[PDB]
Coordinates of C-alpha atoms in Angstrom, one line a residue:
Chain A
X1 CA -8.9 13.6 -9.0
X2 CA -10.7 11.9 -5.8
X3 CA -9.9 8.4 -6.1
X4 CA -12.1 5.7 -4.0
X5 CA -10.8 2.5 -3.0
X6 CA -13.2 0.1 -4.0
X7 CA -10.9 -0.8 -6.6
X8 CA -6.8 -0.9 -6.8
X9 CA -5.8 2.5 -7.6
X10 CA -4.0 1.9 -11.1
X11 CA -3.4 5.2 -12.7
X12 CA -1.0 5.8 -16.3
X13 CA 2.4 7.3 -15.6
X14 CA 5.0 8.5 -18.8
X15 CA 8.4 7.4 -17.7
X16 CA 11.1 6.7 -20.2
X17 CA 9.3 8.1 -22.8
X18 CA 7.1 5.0 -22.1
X19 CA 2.8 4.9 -21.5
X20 CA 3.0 2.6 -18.2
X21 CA 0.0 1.8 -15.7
X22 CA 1.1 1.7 -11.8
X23 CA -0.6 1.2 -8.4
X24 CA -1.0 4.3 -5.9
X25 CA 0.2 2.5 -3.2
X26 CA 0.6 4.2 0.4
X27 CA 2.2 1.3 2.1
X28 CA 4.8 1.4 0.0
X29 CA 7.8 3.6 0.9
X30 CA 8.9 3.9 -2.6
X31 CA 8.5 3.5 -6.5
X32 CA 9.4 0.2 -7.8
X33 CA 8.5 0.0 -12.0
X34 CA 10.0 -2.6 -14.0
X35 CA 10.7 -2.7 -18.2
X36 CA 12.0 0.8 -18.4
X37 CA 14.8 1.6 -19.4
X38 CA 16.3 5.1 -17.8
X39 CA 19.1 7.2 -19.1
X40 CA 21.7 8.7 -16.7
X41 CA 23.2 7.7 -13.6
X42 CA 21.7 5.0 -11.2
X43 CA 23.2 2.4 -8.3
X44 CA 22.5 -0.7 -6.7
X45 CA 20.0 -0.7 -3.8
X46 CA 18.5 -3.3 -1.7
X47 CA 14.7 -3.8 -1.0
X48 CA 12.3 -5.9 0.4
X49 CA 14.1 -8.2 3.6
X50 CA 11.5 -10.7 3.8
X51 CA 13.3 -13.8 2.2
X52 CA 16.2 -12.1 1.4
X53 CA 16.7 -8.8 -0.6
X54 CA 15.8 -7.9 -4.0
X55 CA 18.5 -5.9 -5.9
X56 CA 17.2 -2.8 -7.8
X57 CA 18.6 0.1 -9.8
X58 CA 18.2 3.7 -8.1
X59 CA 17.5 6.3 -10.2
X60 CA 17.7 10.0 -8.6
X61 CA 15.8 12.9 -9.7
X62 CA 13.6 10.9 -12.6
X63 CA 11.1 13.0 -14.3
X64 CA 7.8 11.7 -14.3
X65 CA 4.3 12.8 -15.1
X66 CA 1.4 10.3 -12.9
X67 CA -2.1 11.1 -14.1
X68 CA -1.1 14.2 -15.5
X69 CA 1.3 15.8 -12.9
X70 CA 4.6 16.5 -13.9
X71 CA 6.9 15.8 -11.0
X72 CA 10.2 14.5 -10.4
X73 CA 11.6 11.6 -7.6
X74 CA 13.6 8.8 -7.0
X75 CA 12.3 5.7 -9.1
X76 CA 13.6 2.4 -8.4
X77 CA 14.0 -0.1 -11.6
X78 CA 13.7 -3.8 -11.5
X79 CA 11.5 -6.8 -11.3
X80 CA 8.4 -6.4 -9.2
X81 CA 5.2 -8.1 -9.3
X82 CA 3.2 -4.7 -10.0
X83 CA 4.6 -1.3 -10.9
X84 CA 4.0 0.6 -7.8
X85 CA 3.9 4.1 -6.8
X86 CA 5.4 5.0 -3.8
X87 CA 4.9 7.5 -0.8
X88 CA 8.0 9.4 -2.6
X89 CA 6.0 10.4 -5.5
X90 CA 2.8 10.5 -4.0
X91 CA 4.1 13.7 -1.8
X92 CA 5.3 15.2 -5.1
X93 CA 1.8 15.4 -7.0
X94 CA 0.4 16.8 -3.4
X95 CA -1.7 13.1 -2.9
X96 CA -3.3 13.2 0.1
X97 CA -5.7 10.3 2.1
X98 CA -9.3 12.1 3.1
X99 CA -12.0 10.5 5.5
Chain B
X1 CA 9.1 -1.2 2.9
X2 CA 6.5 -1.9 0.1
X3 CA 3.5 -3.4 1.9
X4 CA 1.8 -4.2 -0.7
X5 CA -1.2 -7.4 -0.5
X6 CA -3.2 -8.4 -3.7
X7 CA -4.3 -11.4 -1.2
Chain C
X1 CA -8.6 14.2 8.6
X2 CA -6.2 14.9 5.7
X3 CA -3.2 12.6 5.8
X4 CA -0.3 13.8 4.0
X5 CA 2.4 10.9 2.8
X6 CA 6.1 12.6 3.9
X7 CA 5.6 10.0 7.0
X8 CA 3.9 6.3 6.9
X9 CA 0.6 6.7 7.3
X10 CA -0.2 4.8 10.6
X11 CA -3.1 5.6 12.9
X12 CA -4.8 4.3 15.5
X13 CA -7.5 1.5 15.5
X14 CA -9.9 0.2 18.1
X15 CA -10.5 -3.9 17.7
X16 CA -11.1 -6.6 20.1
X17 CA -11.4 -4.4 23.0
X18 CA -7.5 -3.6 22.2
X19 CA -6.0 -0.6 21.1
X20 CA -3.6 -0.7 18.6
X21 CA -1.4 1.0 15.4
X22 CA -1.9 0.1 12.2
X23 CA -0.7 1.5 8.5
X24 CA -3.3 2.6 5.5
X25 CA -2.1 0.9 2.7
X26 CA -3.7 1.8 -0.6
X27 CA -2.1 -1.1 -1.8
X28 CA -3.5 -3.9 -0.1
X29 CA -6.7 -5.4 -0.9
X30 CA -7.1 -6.9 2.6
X31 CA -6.6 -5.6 6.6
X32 CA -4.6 -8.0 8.0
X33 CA -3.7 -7.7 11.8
X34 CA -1.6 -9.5 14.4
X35 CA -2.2 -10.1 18.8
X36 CA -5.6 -9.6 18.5
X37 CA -8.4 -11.9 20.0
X38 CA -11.5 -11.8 18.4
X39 CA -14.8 -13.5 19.4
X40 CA -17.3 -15.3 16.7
X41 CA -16.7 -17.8 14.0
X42 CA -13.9 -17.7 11.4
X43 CA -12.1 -19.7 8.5
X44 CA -8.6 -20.2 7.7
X45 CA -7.8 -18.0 4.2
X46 CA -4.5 -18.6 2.3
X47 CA -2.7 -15.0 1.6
X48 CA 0.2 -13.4 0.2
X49 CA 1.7 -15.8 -2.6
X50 CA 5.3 -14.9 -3.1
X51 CA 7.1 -18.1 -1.7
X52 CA 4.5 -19.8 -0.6
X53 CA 1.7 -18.7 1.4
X54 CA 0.5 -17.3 4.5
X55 CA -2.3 -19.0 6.0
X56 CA -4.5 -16.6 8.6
X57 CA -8.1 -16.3 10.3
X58 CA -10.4 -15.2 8.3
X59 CA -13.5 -13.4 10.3
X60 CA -16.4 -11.4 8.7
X61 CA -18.3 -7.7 9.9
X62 CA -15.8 -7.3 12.4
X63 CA -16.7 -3.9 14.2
X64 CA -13.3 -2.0 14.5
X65 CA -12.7 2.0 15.1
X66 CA -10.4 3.4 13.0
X67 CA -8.9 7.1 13.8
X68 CA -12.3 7.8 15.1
X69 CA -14.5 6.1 12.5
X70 CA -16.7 2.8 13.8
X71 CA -17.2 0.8 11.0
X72 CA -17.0 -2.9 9.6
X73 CA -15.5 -5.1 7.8
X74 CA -13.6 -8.2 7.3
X75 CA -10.5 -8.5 9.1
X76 CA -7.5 -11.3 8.7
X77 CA -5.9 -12.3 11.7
X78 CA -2.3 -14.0 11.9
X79 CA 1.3 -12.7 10.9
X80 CA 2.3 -9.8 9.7
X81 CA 5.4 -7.6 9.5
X82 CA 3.4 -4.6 10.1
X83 CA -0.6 -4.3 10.7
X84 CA -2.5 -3.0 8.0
X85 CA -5.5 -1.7 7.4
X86 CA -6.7 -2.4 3.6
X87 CA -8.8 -1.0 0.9
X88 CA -11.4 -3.3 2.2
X89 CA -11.8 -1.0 5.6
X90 CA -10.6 2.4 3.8
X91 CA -13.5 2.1 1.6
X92 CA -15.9 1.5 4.4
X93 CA -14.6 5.1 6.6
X94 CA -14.9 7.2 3.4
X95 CA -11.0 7.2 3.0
X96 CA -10.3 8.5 -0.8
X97 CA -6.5 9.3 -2.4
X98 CA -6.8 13.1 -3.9
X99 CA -4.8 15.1 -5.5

């Protein structure tokens, strides 16, 4: 698709066998969903730095279809104020920005 | 890392 | 232009007579810039929200240049970890997300 930016870019993602909504977001290094719950193997990692650090589970190599692409990434799990798609898995479904 | 701003 | 996501997405903007970097964040509703001096009337605006808020400068039709594009828009001056240029201004160069 060709998605302007007059609104937030909230597409539908399957991850977990779950329907989820997330935001494309290019300032964002990487995926951050919360409430899913991924099978396989997964550590700690540290995010954010402003404050402190938020603790999140890393999941390698998660399959995961956004608006229709099938792809597969990194997703980190854990609480975030918006489920957000990250650079990481924008490069994957080929999402480029166009002016 | 995640720059988000929804204000 | 076509911007590809494997690298942040910074360019370079022209504002206040200064030149300066700033990152295209898809995720951000507003452009929020730091060190710059701009002429004409503003009001303060109360951002962000986790842990309080930020307060910055709020100033309206600001003409700034970004990577080559002279357009307008609002523009909120005061702290930031990194600048960033928001839907706001995206919409008004043409910048879409495609894929």
């Amino acid at each position: 698709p060709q998605i302007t930016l007059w609104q937030r870019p909230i597409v539908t993602i399957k991850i977990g066998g779950q329907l989820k909504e997330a935001l494309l977001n290019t300032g964002a290094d990487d995926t951050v969903l919360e409430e899913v719950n991924l099978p396989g193997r997964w550590k700690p990692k540290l995010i954010g730095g402003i404050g402190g650090f938020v603790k999140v589970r890393q999941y390698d190599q998660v399959p995961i279809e956004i608006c229709g692409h099938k792809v597969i990434g990194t997703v980190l799990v854990g609480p975030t104020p918006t489920n957000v798609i990250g650079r990481n898995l924008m490069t994957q479904i080929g999402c480029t920005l166009n002016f | 890392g995640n720059f988000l701003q929804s204000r």
